[PDB]
Amino acid sequence: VQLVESGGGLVQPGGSLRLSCAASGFNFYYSSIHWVRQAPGKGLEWVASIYSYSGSTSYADSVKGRFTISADTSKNTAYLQMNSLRAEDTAVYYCARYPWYWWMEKPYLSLYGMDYWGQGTLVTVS
Amino acid sequence: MTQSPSSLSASVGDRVTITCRASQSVSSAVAWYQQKPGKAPKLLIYSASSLYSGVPSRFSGSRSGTDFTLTISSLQPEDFATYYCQQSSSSLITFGQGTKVEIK
Amino acid sequence: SELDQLRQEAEQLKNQIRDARKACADATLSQITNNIDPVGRIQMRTRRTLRGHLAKIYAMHWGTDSRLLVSASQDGKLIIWDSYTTNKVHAIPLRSSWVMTCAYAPSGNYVACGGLDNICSIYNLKTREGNVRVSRELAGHTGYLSCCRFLDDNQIVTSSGDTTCALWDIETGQQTTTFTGHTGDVMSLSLAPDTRLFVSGACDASAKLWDVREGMCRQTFTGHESDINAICFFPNGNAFATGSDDATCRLFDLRADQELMTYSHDNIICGITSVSFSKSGRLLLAGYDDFNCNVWDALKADRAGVLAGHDNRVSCLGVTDDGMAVATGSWDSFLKIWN
Amino acid sequence: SGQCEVPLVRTDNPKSWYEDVEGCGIQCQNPLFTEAEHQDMHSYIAAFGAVTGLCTLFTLATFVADWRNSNRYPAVILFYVNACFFVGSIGWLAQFMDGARREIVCRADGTMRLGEPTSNETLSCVIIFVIVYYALMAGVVWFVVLTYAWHTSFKALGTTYQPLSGKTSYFHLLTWSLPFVLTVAILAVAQVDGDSVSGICFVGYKNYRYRAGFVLAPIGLVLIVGGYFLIRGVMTLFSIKSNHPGLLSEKAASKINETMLRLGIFGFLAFGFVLITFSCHFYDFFNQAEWERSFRDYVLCQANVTIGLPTKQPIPDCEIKNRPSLLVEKINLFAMFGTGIAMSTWVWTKATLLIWRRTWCRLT
Amino acid sequence: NTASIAQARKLVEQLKMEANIDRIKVSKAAADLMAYCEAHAKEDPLLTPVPASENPFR
Amino acid sequence: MGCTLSAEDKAAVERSKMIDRNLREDGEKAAREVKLLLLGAGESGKNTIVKQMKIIHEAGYSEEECKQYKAVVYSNTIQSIIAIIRAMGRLKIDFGDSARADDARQLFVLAGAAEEGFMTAELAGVIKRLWKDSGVQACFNRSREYQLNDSAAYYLNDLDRIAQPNYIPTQQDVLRTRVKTTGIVETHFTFKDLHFKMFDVGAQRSERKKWIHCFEGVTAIIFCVALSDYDLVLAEDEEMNRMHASMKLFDSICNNKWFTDTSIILFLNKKDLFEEKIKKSPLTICYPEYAGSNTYEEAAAYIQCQFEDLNKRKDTKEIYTHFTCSTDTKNVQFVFDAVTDVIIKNNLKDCGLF
Ligand SMILES: C[C@H](CC[C@@H]1OC1(C)C)[C@H]1CC[C@H]2[C@@H]3CC=C4C[C@@H](O)CC[C@]4(C)[C@H]3CC[C@]12C
Secondary structure: OOOOHHHHEEEEEOOOOOEEEEOOOOOOOOOOEEEEEEEOOOOEEEEEEEOOOOOOOOEEOOOOOOOOEEOOOOOOOEEEEEOEEEEEEEEEEEEEEOOOOOOOOOOOOOOOOOEEEEOOOEOOOO | OEEEEOOOOOOOOOOEEEEEEOOOOOOOEEEEEOOOOOEEEEEEEEOOOOOEEEEEEOOEEEEEEEEEEEOOOOOOOOOOHHHHHEEEEOOOOOOOOOOOOOOO | OOHHHHHHHHHHHHHHHHHHHHHHHOOOOOHOOOOOOOOOOOOOOOEEEEOOOOOOOEEEEOOOOOOOEEEEEEOEEEEEEOOOOOEEEEEEEEEEEEEEEEEEEEEEEEEEEEEEOEEEHHHHHHHOOOOOEEEEEEOOOOOOOOEEEEEOEEEEEEOOOOOOOEEEEEOOOOOEEEEEOOOEEEEEEOOOOOOOOOEEEOOOEEEEEEEEEOEEEEEOOOOOOOOOOOOEOOOOOEEOOOOOOOOOOEEEEEOOOOEEEEEEOOOOOOEEOOOOOOOOOOOOEEEOOOOOOOEEEEOOOOOOOOOOOOOEEEEEEEEOOOOOOEEEEOOOOOOOEOO | OOOOOOOEEEEEOOOOOOOOOOEEEOOOOOOOOHHHHHHHHHHHHHHHHHHHHHHHHHHHHHHHHHHOOOOOHHHHHHHHHHHHHHHHHHHHOOOOOOOOOOOOOOOOOOOOOOOOOOOOOOOOHHHHHHHHHHHHHHHHHHHHHHHHHHHHHOOOOOOOOOOOOHHHHHHHHHHHHHHHHHHHOOOOOOOOEEEOOOOEEOOOOOOOHHHHHHHHHHHHHHHHHHHHHHHHHHHHHOOOOOOOOOOOOOHHHHHHHHHHHHHHHHHHHHHHHHHHHHHHHHHHHHHHHHHHHHHHHHHHHHHOOOOOOOOOOOOOOOOOOOOOOOEEEEEHHHHHHHHHHOOOOOOOOOOOOHHHHHHHHOOO | HHHHHHHHHHHHHHHHHOOOOOOOOOHHHHHHHHHHHOOOOOOOOOOOOOOOOOOOOO | OOOHHHHHHHHHHHHHHHHHHHOOOHHHHHOOOEEEEEHHHHHOHHHHHHHHHOOOOOOOOOOHHHHHHHHHHHHHHHHHHHHHHHHHHHHHOOOOOOOHHHHHHHHHHOOOOOOOOOHHHHHHHHHHHHOOOOOOHHHHOHHHHHOOOOOHHHHOHHHHHHOOOOOOOOOHHHHHHHHOOOOOOOOOEEEEEEEEEEOOOOOOOOOOOHHHOOOOOEEEEEEEOOOOOOOOOOOOOOOOEHHHHHHHHHHHHOOOOOOOOOOEEEEEEEHHHHHHHHHHHOOOOOOOOOOOOOOHHHHHHHHHHHHOOOOOOOOOOOOOOOOOOOOOOOHHHHHHHHHHHHHHHHHHHOOOOO
C-alpha cells in the first residue's frame, strides 16, 4: 500500500505554499504522520509530526513555531504551510507513517519506526 | 537529545558493524534505515531487535545498555546505499549523521 | 438440543476432513521411494565429554553459531559450555531448583530458563557490570511451563500446563497473545525457520499448527493413540515430525494436510523423549527408555543404529545449526557429542 | 675326579657348592624328610587353596552382578581384599603342574635359585614370589584401610552429614604405592632362594636376619593400629545404646547389635591369626640354632654314616638329636588360608541370599 | 450447561473455519520432499566422513 | 607445551577452574539437606501441620530484603497499570477524557517502561493523571472479565507514599504482595541440628503423570489423611467416599516404579473432632464389614491397618503412623526419629552390613 505527494517548486523567500501528502491503504486516525526534509550533500533532519489521536502536535528543534500542519479526518490527507524562509530551505521533502498506539486498529505487537514512505516532493528558493 | 554514529565503509563478502551511542539513557525505541541515493528511505529494524517482514535475514540489531549496533553478516553486492539510525523514545524526533558503503 | 445438532455437524465435518484425506491420497511415499539408493553403515564416536554436573540433566540447547551449548541441571544450576575448547565458560544459580527447559538466543545475548513453579526467567550476559544479573521475569500461567523458544531478541513464545501457549514481549512482562484450543496438556513445541509458524503437541494425540501473528488455530493433526512428547520441524518449512510413548513417530506435511509414514522397529516398546532432524532432511535422531539412540532414514523408513553410550535413560538431544555435530544429554549427569 | 656323597649333587660349576670339599654341589630339596611328606603338604595346600578359591569366587560373583549399583563407599574395599588374595591363592596352585616342583625352583645343575641373573638362570622363580608378596602386602594394607574407613564412617554417624568423600584416591594411591616400595625393598636383597617342602620360593635358610623384621613386623604394626581402630570404632558405635538424639529404632538396634557382635567375632579371630604366626617363629627362634647345629652334625654324618661301617652291620644311618617340626608349618599355612576365609564371612549375610536366588532363578 | 454449549459453539466454529482448506496430492509434495532431500545431500558432515581440516571435532 | 594458547588461556582455563571450585563446593548444601515430599487430601490439615513444623519466623520487614520487595512492589504497580491500559485498549470504543493528551502521554511511559530501578517523577506524574481519569475505573470494574491482578486498586490510590524517593514499604504491603496462587510452596527449616526442606502440591492438574519422576532421589514422602472424611461428601461424583480416592492415589504412589526404596510417613491430623463425632456418626457409614466393635480407640487402629495393608508385594517400605497433636514438638521429634531411622538404614545399607 502506497502514498503520494504534491506541491513542489520555488517562490521568493518569506511566503508560504500548500504542501500535500496523501496516505492510502489503511486507517488514518490510528496512526501519526511525520514530515522530514533532506538537503543535497547533507544528512536527514526532522521537520514535523502530526498526531491524529489528540492533535497536540509539535515541530522541530529550530524551525518550530513558524510552520503550520493540518490533516483531515475524512479525506485522510495532510497539508503543510511554511512561512519564514531562509537559505537552507532548498530541500527534498518526505512524509511517513508512524503507528504510535498499536492496539486500537487491531490488538497487535509494538512497532518503533517510520513504517511506510513516499517518494517526496522538492522545494527551493532563489 | 543527540547521538553519535561511526562513519566507515565496507567491502564485498564481509560482515560489517555499525555502532550508535545516544546522549542520555534512552529507552528501547530505536529504528534503522537504508537509503539508496536520491531514492526512498527503507526500514531495516524497528524496536532495535526485530527486522521488518520481507527484508532478508542477514541483518540483526543488538542492544547493550545505552549502545546500539547494526550487524550485517555476509552481505550481497546489491547493498550499496547509506544507512541511518533513529531515536524515537520521546515526542521529539531525530536522526543520525549516517554512513555509506563503497568498495576499493 | 442444539449442542447435539452442532456435534452431529462436527462429526460429519470430521467425516468431510477424513473424506478429503482419503480423496487426496493417491500413493504413499514407500513405493515411490522403492528405487532410492541406501546410504549404508554410519558410525558416530563421542568426540568430547562433559562431566561438570551433579544431578540429572533435563534439557539442553544449541546456539546459532555452533560455538556455545546451554544445559540445565536439576540442582538449581544452569551451565553453558564452549564446544571446541570444552571449558565451563559460565554457570549460574537460580532461586528455584526445578527447571525443565531452556532456550538460547539467535543473537547470542539472552538465555531463558523455566520450570515447575509457573514462572519464566530471562538473563543477560553482555553487561558492563562484569557479572550476570537477574534481568527479567515472566508470570501469569497456572500450570507448569513445558518448553520455551526464542523467535527474536524481544518476543518469546512459551507453552503452559493449562493446555495453552502464549507470545510475550520481555520489556513489558505481559503476554501479547494467548493460544487456546488444545484439550490435553501441551508437552513440547517448535517453530518454523522463517519465524512465522509454530506447532504445539499435547498429551491428547493431536498436533496444532499455529500462525504466530493471527492467533487462530490454523491446522489440526489427529491420528495418534497416546501422548506426543517430541516435536521437530523440517528445514524447508513444509513437513513436521512427531513422536509418542511406543516409538510411533509419524511424519506430517503442512502443505498437503495428511499423514506420511509411521515408524516402528519390532523390538521396541519404550517411550520417546525428543526428536531432531539434520540439514539434509533424510535423518531422524531419537532416543528411547532402553538407553538407545538410532538414526532413522526419512525415505528408506528403517535403520537401527547404535550409539547407546548412556547408563541412565536418555533425556534430550539436538542437532547443530550447520549440521556438523549432534549433542546428547541423559540422566547420567553427563553431556556427550557425536559426529 | 673325587668322590660325591649322597646329599651332595654332581655339578660342573664352583659358583654354588657346599664349600667344605670341592667337586660336588648341593640339591634343591630339604633332605631331612621323605617324599611322602611332600605329598602330604602338597595335598593340604591344594585342598585349602581350592576352598579359598571357591569362597573368593563366591564373594566376587555377587560384586560383578551389582557392580553398576555398588561402585561406592567402603564396601568396594571389601571387594578388594579377596581380589588381592585370589591372585595369591591360585599362585599357590602352582603345584601339580608339568614340572613346577623343580623347574621353577631348581637350576640347570641342581642347587636352588640364588636369585642372580649373572649365572644364566632364567627369571622363572622371582615371578611367583613377587605376585604372592604383592598379594599378601596388598591384602594387609587394604585390610587396615578398611578399618580406617569403618572408624571414620562410624565416627561420622551424625546421621545425615559428612561422608568423607574427597580422600578415596589418596588411599588407592597409598595402597598401590606401598607394595611397590616393599617389592623393591625386598628386591634390594635379591639373593632369594627356594623352599621344596612348601614349593614357594623365599629367603631364610641361612638368613633369618634379613627375613625377620622387614617381612613380618609391618603385619604386627597393622595388627596394633587395626585393633586400635576396631576398639575405638566399637566404643564410638556403642553410644547409640545411650542415644543422645532420642529413644528410637529398636528394629535398627537389633541390626546394629548383630553387626556389633559381627565386628567383635571378626576382631577376635583377626587378633589370634597373626600371633599364631608369631608363635611359629617363636618356636623357630630357639630351634633354628639347634637345627643348623644338627645340620652341621648331619653333614659330618654324611661321612660318619659310612665311617664306622664294617661288613657285619645292617643298612646304616646316624642318630640325630632333634628332627624338624614336620607339622607346625601347617599352623601358619592354615592361618593365611584362615585370613583368606575371614573376608568371605562378610558376604555370608542374611541379605545376599535374596539377590543370589534372584540371579539364579532368572535363568534356571 | 450453557458454558458447555458456549465452548461447543467455539469448537464447531473452529471446525467450520478449518472446513475449507485447499489440499494438494501427496505424490506431488512427496516428490518435492525428495527434491529437497537430493538438493542438500552433498554438504552435510553427518553423511560423509570429513578430514581434520574441515571437521573441528578431531 | 604451548605459549600463545596460555595468554588467552590465563583468562579461559582460570575461569573454568575458578567456576569448577565455585561449583564443587555445593556439597555443603547438596548432601547435608534431606528432601521431604508432602502429599494428601486435607488442605487445612496440611497448612496447620506445615505451620507447626515450621519454626515461627518473622522475616518480612528485614533491611536486607528491603530493595527486593521494593522492586516487587514497583514491578506489580507498572504491570497492573500496563495491564489496565491494555484492557482500556481492548475496550472497543475509546474512553478517555476531554483533553485526550492523557492517553497519548501514557505512551511516553509505556515506551518508558524499560527500567528496573528507582521510579521516575514522570511516571508518577502521568499515573496521577491516569487514575484521576474516570475511564480507567469504568473499565477496571469491568476488568474482571479479562486477566487482572487483584492488588490493583490499593497502590493507585496510595501512589503518593510510592512517589516519595528512598521510601521503605511495611510488612502489610509485602504480605499483600507475597500471596501466590499455584506452584511450589517450598519451605525449609533446621531442627535438631539437621536441615530439612519441604515441598508441596496444590492440585495443579487433574491427575499426576509426568512431574513425579522429577522427585526421584527423595529420602522420605509424607502422606496426610484427615480421618474424619468417610462421611464428608466427595462433591464431584455420586460416590460420597472421599477416603477411597485418597486411598487409590496412595496405592498408585506405593506401586510407582520410581518409588521402590523411598519410605513413607503417614499422618492422621483430624482425630480430635472425630473423637466427639464418633458418637453421632460411628463406623456405620465407612465400611459395613467391621463387625469387631463400635468405639473409637480400636476402630481407629483398624482403619489404620486397613489403610496400611494396601502395600502390594513390598516388605522394604517402612510405613510409619502417627495421630494428632496439640503441641507438635513431640510430633516433629517423632518425624525426626523416623527420618533418622531411614537415613541410618540407608547408611548401613551403603556400608554393606544390612
Ligand atoms: C607364613 C607365610 C604365609 C602366610 C602369611 O603369614 C600370613 C600373612 C598368614 C610364608 C611366606 C614365606 C614363608 C617362609 C619362607 C622362608 C622360610 C625360611 C626357613 O628357614 C623356615 C620357613 C620360612 C620362615 C617360611 C615359613 C612360611 C612363610 C613365612
